[PDB]
């Protein structure tokens, strides 16, 4: 009865930090091992299996082996990284849709804590870029058939727990 949740997206999106931050509920390692946790939803105890894909961003021959039997994908992008948001529509959704057309996925925005950071807006304001907004974010979640769209911060943990409750919710179909 273990729900398989795979976290996909560009590197520097913080996928690993996202899973570690969530499972710290110590030394934060580089290599995150498959981790399962029991989550209560509607009075029922569900077992959530978490799987990281960190490092395979551009090892196209490796990624496909992570997909069989996935119940829900978390397609992530950094709100402060227009190129990661753009790769969701360009690389990730097409990839998961290809290998798992019936498998649901949440559009996930990370590092929302840096969206409120001058340094970032400044050194983002360079290449004529600005952080991504929930509005522009949902429209893409819409365009790509994502179940929903959620965001959080591994750092502050704001919206963290919610991301995973929805992952389970989405998988329960």
């Amino acid at each position: 009865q273990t729900i398989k949740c795979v976290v996909v997206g560009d590197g520097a999106v913080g996928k690993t930090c996202l899973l570690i931050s969530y499972t710290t509920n110590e030394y934060v390692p580089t290599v995150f091992d498959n981790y399962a946790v029991t989550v209560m939803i509607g009075g029922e105890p569900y077992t959530l299996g978490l799987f990281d894909t960190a490092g395979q961003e551009d090892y196209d021959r490796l990624r496909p082996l992570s997909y069989p039997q996935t119940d829900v994908f978390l397609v992530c992008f950094s709100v402060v990284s227009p190129s990661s948001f753009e790769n969701v529509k360009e690389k990730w959704v097409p990839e998961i849709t290809h290998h798992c057309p019936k498998t649901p996925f949440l559009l996930v925005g990370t590092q929302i804590d840096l969206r409120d950071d001058p340094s970032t807006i400044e050194k983002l304001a360079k290449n004529k870029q600005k952080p991504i907004t929930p509005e522009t974010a949902e429209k893409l979640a819409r365009d790509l058939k994502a179940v929903k769209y959620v965001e959080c911060s591994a750092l502050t943990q704001k919206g963290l727990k919610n991301v995973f409750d929805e992952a389970i919710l989405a998988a329960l179909e």
């Binding site: 009865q1 273990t2 590197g11 690993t16 030394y27 390692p29 580089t30 290599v31 995150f32 091992d33 498959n34 981790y35 399962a36 946790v37 029991t38 077992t47 299996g49 799987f51 990281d52 894909t53 960190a54 490092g55 395979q56 961003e57 090892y59 196209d60 021959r61 490796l62 990624r63 496909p64 082996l65 992570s66 069989p68 039997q69």
Partner: protein
């Protein structure tokens, strides 16, 4: 428990072949090799920092990776951390049948899962060393340890 690593490899290779059409496995082999080895290296670094409470700068991390890179005469990637071999096993029938047999009396979704992850680590290492003898895991670890000692 006992498992036929050879049959697993054939099933892993078959899965790889579905990606193209000529059933190529060369590219997959190259990517997995540098990935599995890089993760082995990162794993050794994690273990080192944990027990010592040390913090190694990404610069130093790079020197360590190049050092291991030179010693192995193998290209590496300091972001390596997830082997497609371990992920392949996760959803493999034959392998999971062994996971069950191994969990025996226990089936606490959690205990079963941890047992699965532990067996995934053990079997992929075994699968790696039989098909990727560019260097063994214990060797990679030792070489890395010596790099950490030299640069950290």
């Amino acid at each position: 428990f006992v498992i036929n690593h050879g049959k697993l490899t054939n099933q892993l290779l078959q899965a790889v072949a579905k990606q193209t059409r000529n059933g190529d496995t060369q590219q997959w082999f190259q990517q997995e090799q540098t990935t599995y080895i890089s993760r082995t290296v990162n794993r050794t670094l994690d273990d080192y920092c944990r027990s010592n409470n040390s913090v190694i700068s990404k610069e130093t991390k790079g020197h360590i990776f190049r050092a291991v890179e030179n010693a192995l005469q193998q290209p590496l990637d300091m972001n390596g951390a997830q082997s497609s071999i371990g992920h392949f096993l996760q959803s493999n029938k034959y392998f999971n049948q062994k996971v069950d047999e191994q969990c025996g009396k226990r089936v606490d979704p959690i205990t079963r899962f941890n047992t699965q992850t532990k067996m995934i680590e053990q079997v992929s290492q075994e699968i790696f060393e039989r098909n990727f003898s560019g260097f063994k895991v214990s060797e990679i670890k030792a070489i890395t340890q010596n790099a950490i000692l030299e640069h950290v």
